[PDB]
Amino acid sequence: SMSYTWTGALITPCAAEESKLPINALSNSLLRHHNMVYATTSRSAGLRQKKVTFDRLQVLDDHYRDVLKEMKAKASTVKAKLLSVEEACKLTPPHSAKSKFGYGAKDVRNLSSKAVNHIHSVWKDLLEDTVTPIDTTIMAKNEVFCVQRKPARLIVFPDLGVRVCEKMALYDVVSTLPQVVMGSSYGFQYSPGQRVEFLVNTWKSKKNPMGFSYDTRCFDSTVTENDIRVEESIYQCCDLAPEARQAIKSLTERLYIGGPLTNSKGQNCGYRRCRASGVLTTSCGNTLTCYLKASAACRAAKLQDCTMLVNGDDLVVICESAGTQEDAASLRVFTEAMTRYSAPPGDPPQPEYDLELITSCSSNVSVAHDASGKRVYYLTRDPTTPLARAAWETARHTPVNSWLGNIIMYAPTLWARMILMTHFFSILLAQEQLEKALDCQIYGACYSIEPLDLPQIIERLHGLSAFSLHSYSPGEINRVASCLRKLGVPPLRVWRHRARSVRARLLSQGGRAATCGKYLFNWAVKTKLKLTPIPAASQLDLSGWFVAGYSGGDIYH
Ligand SMILES: CS(=O)(=O)Nc1ccc2c(c1)S(=O)(=O)NC(C1=C(O)[C@@H]3CCC[C@@H]3N(Cc3ccc(F)cc3)C1=O)=N2
């Protein structure tokens, strides 16, 4: 069937949409080539509609059913709990989209009777009706890129009342089931340090390692009704309260499988028969379905000593080489199988023989050296999109601070340390906003973070070496430098100079600010301070951080 059917009604915005990079007195300190940076708007949604709309065929074989059997056996060991309304309400982001039914995210968060009443009525209707399609909204995402333009990605989500109900029925399932079913292959269980460790240990466990990323073309659109019913059958294996079983069946039939699409103006835009990108089960559903199809395709292709790492639709496979000819043929069979399962590639996958050439979760492994001269592996990326987004956030407040998410996940990198840390701490100092909690997204869930807790956060996720890395690889250095030239970003020498001021300013203020100056900017000075384990790091409550993925899942921690 068709991933989508369209009426002709346009996908519409709520507010005016800026596409040109907004400029203020701080923009030029970061980036000169403003016209390189753009944001997507609803006005390009028609272009995206074209791409995501296609027929899906699916041919399922013994490997497919075999792997599914294994997954269900593992799922059967999972006991999951129903969340109370209030419990589910407290998981709602403060900024989440308001209900069509007279209340908003803040009414949910502070448990207004109006919100709670409606949520109970929604839950009741779920138990009683397992057939009536549930309305969704389709919106266009506003996201920031550098020019090579990408059309806007789309988001499809049910009403707020429904979203709290999903949490009630499925928050525990989607948080706990994936690791049990997929074990070490489940990517969202790892911090950056743990993930790079897993990638490096896996690479080193092969006699002759070969690896590849598999880019499915528009994954969500490839997801069929079969896939969604299959994922429900996996959920149903869990030990669940009777109400949870019924609500899960109901949400599957009425929401997850498909439904009508409505724009922000309330006009019918068409019908969805594929994965909605804005439901609680988006990340878990995609991860299970990706792992099932890939695991079975590995068996079809007869990959040797094959290890998978899966983050939703993001997949990397590391195995034993049979030489370049056989590896290319193997990957073709793997791709043929994935295609039969309804997950054809975007870019065809290529076998890689150097771990550092493999991009997965938008990141590649690279090497640097710590204080002792010891080798340290870390995850990095082309800093173009991070810097384009940082530029936008220099002039505009956004509900999610990409810059902060990037500093947290890419702390050990040359570009996050030299540029992002220097620029944004300078801004926080000038506004006297060091103390102010900032929102960011980690594995799709929303967190309120205090920038002053960064040293502890970084110690916990990357280790102390994150504060002492040097002697970066020529390849990493060249990619960073070439990016700075492209965007018109001041050279790293300018950033070192600026950093020395930021550092001294932070040290002058004492307390947690001085700690930031000491740890985050030790790289900026010749005569370094001694960086010992931070006392406060040991008390940090980072439970919930690297448990599961929640992209589009409307989750706040
Ligand atoms: C839509 S889906 O099917 O869930 N696919 C998906 C793939 C990959 C996904 C996500 C979703 S996500 O929206 O949960 N966030 C992330 C993610 C993050 O949340 C953080 C935040 C900033 C980027 C960072 N990265 C890159 C990354 C990942 C691991 C790592 F150790 C270092 C860096 C990520 O991979 N990756």
Q: DSSP per residue over 442-487, as a string?
A: ETTEEEEE-GGGHHHHHHHHH-GGGGT-B---HHHHHHHHHHHHHH
For the chain, report the end-to-end CA distance as a whole number of angstroms: 38
Residue 442 CA: nearest ligand 1 atom is: 19
366 in contact with ligand 1, CB cutoff 6 A? no
In this structure, are residues 378 and 465 in contact, taking their beta carbons and an 8 Å threshold? no
CA 443–ligand 1 middle distance (angstroms): 5
Indicate the Cα dihedral angle 351, 353, 355, 359, nearest 10°: -30
In this structure, are residues 76 and 237 in contact, taking their beta carbons and an 8 Å threshold? yes
Tokens of 107: 């009414």
The span from the CA of 439 to the CA of 448, in Å, is: 4
Which of these, 4, 554, 56, 40, lies nearest to 281 by C-alpha position? 554
In this structure, are residues 30 and 423 in contact, taking their beta carbons and an 8 Å threshold? yes
The span from the CA of 23 to the CA of 141, in Å, is: 21
The span from the CA of 521 to the CA of 528, in Å, is: 9
Question: Looking at the structure, do residues 163 and 192 belong to the same domain, yes or no?
Answer: no
CA 408–ligand 1 middle distance (angstroms): 12
Nearest CA to ligand 1 atom 10: 443
Beta strands 268-272 and 259-262 are antiparallel
Q: Which residues pair with 378 in a beta bridge?
A: 366
Helix (H) or strand (E) holding 275: none
Amino acid type, 78: V
- CA–CA distance from 173 to each of 2, 112, 303, 529 (Å)? 29, 27, 31, 46
444 in contact with ligand 1, CB cutoff 6 A? yes
Instruction: Please tell me whether 382 is known to bind a ligand.
Output: no
176 φψ region: left (φ > 0), alpha (ψ -120 to 50), beta (else): alpha
553 in contact with ligand 1, CB cutoff 6 A? no
- CA–CA distance from 204 to each of 188, 199, 214 (Å)? 22, 9, 21
Sign of the Cα pseudo-torsion (143, 147, 148, 149, in order)? positive
Share in percent of the chain as helix, strand, coil (round to 5): 50, 15, 35
CA 389–ligand 1 middle distance (angstroms): 16
The span from the CA of 82 to the CA of 102, in Å, is: 26
462 in contact with ligand 1, CB cutoff 6 A? no
Nearest CA to ligand 1 atom 25: 361
Question: Looking at the structure, do residues 338 and 213 belong to the same domain, yes or no?
Answer: yes
Question: Looking at the structure, do residues 103 and 201 belong to the same domain, yes or no?
Answer: no
φ, ψ for residue 452 (rounded to 5)?
-70, -15
Question: Looking at the structure, do residues 235 and 208 belong to the same domain, yes or no?
Answer: no
The span from the CA of 274 to the CA of 418, in Å, is: 42
520 in contact with ligand 1, CB cutoff 6 A? no
In this structure, are residues 450 and 404 in contact, taking their beta carbons and an 8 Å threshold? no
Q: Which residues pair with 157 in a beta bridge?
A: 137
324 in contact with ligand 1, CB cutoff 6 A? no
Q: Please list the alpha-helical segments (H only) found in 307-453.
A: 324-340, 384-395, 402-409, 414-415, 422-430
| Residue for token pair 């000593």 | 305
Question: Looking at the structure, do residues 437 and 531 belong to the same domain, yes or no?
Answer: yes
In this structure, are residues 2 and 55 in contact, taking their beta carbons and an 8 Å threshold? yes
Nearest CA to ligand 1 atom 30: 192
DSSP conformation class of 168? H
The span from the CA of 277 to the CA of 20, in Å, is: 26
Beta strands 364-369 and 375-380 are antiparallel
Helix (H) or strand (E) holding 367: strand 364-369
Tokens of 421: 């840390």
312 in contact with ligand 1, CB cutoff 6 A? yes
Half-sphere exposure in the Cβ direction for 58 (13 Å, CA): 17
The span from the CA of 301 to the CA of 299, in Å, is: 5
φ, ψ for residue 386 (rounded to 5)?
-50, -40
Kindly write down the DSSP assignment for every residue of 236-261, as one continuous string.
TTSB--HHHHHHHHHHIIIIIS-EEE
Nearest CA to ligand 1 atom 28: 361
The span from the CA of 76 to the CA of 486, in Å, is: 52
At residue 511, the 3 state secondary structure works out as: helix
Identify the burial level of 108 via C-beta atoms within 10 angstroms of its C-beta, where 0-12 means exposed, 13-18 middle and 19 or more buried. Answer: buried
The span from the CA of 509 to the CA of 86, in Å, is: 41
Which of these, 110, 91, 227, lies nearest to 169 by C-alpha position? 91
Tokens of 141: 């995402």
Of the residues 297, 329, 363, the one at which a domain ends:
363
φ, ψ for residue 137 (rounded to 5)?
-105, 135
Sign of the Cα pseudo-torsion (176, 66, 258, 58, in order)? positive
CB-CB neighbours of 385 under 10 Å: 18
CB-CB neighbours of 299 under 10 Å: 18
Which of these, 360, 402, 398, lies nearest to 381 by C-alpha position? 360
Question: Looking at the structure, do residues 100 and 23 belong to the same domain, yes or no?
Answer: no
**Backbone break loci in the chain, preceding residues, C–N > 2.5 A:** 148
189 in contact with ligand 1, CB cutoff 6 A? no
Beta strands 209-214 and 259-262 are unpaired
285 in contact with ligand 1, CB cutoff 6 A? no
The span from the CA of 131 to the CA of 483, in Å, is: 52
The span from the CA of 418 to the CA of 528, in Å, is: 16
DSSP conformation class of 361? T
| Residue for token pair 């999951």 | 80
The span from the CA of 390 to the CA of 415, in Å, is: 12
213 in contact with ligand 1, CB cutoff 6 A? no
137 in contact with ligand 1, CB cutoff 6 A? no
Mutate to test the pocket of ligand 1, among 182, 311, 377 (most ligand atoms within 8 A of CB): 311
Nearest CA to ligand 1 atom 2: 312
Question: Looking at the structure, do residues 454 and 505 belong to the same domain, yes or no?
Answer: yes
360 in contact with ligand 1, CB cutoff 6 A? no
Question: Looking at the structure, do residues 76 and 32 belong to the same domain, yes or no?
Answer: no
The span from the CA of 205 to the CA of 197, in Å, is: 12
φ, ψ for residue 120 (rounded to 5)?
-60, -40
The span from the CA of 199 to the CA of 318, in Å, is: 9
232 Cβ contact partners less than 8 Å away, ≥ 6 residues apart = 248, 249, 252, 256
Which of these, 390, 407, 361, lies nearest to 37 by C-alpha position? 390
Instruction: Please tell me whether 314 is known to bind a ligand.
Output: yes
Amino acid type, 4: Y
Which of these, 16, 20, 19, 7, lies nearest to 44 by C-alpha position? 19
Indicate the Cα dihedral angle 264, 268, 272, 276, nearest 10°: 10
Question: Looking at the structure, do residues 85 and 175 belong to the same domain, yes or no?
Answer: yes
206 Cβ contact partners less than 8 Å away, ≥ 6 residues apart = 305, 318, 319, 320, 321
CB-CB neighbours of 70 under 10 Å: 13
The span from the CA of 16 to the CA of 67, in Å, is: 48
Instruction: Please tell me whether 313 is known to bind a ligand.
Output: yes
Amino acid type, 358: I
φ, ψ for residue 260 (rounded to 5)?
-75, 150
402 in contact with ligand 1, CB cutoff 6 A? no
CA 361–ligand 1 middle distance (angstroms): 6
Which of these, 519, 548, 369, lies nearest to 457 by C-alpha position? 519
Of the residues 345, 363, 381, the one at which a domain ends:
363
φ, ψ for residue 503 (rounded to 5)?
-55, -55
- CA–CA distance from 300 to each of 119, 309, 326, 335, 337 (Å)? 46, 18, 14, 10, 7
Amino acid type, 360: S
At residue 264, the 3 state secondary structure works out as: coil
409 in contact with ligand 1, CB cutoff 6 A? yes
Beta strands 438-442 and 445-449 are antiparallel
Q: Please list the alpha-helical segments (H only) found in 341-383.
A: none
Question: Looking at the structure, do residues 289 and 250 belong to the same domain, yes or no?
Answer: no
Residue 550 CA: nearest ligand 1 atom is: 14
Question: Looking at the structure, do residues 381 and 506 belong to the same domain, yes or no?
Answer: yes
Mark 270-287 as b/e (b = at least 16 C-beta within 10 Å): bbbbbbbbbbbbbbbbbb
Tokens of 166: 């999903």
In this structure, are residues 301 and 334 in contact, taking their beta carbons and an 8 Å threshold? yes
The span from the CA of 418 to the CA of 175, in Å, is: 35
CATH code of residue 343: 3.30.70.270
Number of domains forming the structure of the chain: 4
The span from the CA of 257 to the CA of 255, in Å, is: 6
In this structure, are residues 258 and 271 in contact, taking their beta carbons and an 8 Å threshold? yes
Which of these, 526, 529, 524, lies nearest to 493 by C-alpha position? 524
Question: Looking at the structure, do residues 109 and 139 belong to the same domain, yes or no?
Answer: no
Tokens of 525: 């000075």
In this structure, are residues 543 and 173 in contact, taking their beta carbons and an 8 Å threshold? no
The span from the CA of 381 to the CA of 428, in Å, is: 25
DSSP conformation class of 556? B
DSSP conformation class of 20? B
Which of these, 42, 396, 428, 221, lies nearest to 407 by C-alpha position? 428
Beta strands 314-320 and 268-272 are unpaired
Nearest CA to ligand 1 atom 16: 443
Residue 361 CA: nearest ligand 1 atom is: 35
Of the residues 340, 363, 386, the one at which a domain ends:
363
User: What is the extent of the structural domain holding 340?
Assistant: 187-223+281-363
Residue 311 CA: nearest ligand 1 atom is: 7
Indicate the Cα dihedral angle 550, 395, 44, 277, nearest 10°: 10
Nearest CA to ligand 1 atom 26: 361
Mutate to test the pocket of ligand 1, among 274, 288, 409 (most ligand atoms within 8 A of CB): 409
In this structure, are residues 365 and 8 in contact, taking their beta carbons and an 8 Å threshold? no
Tokens of 20: 């040109």
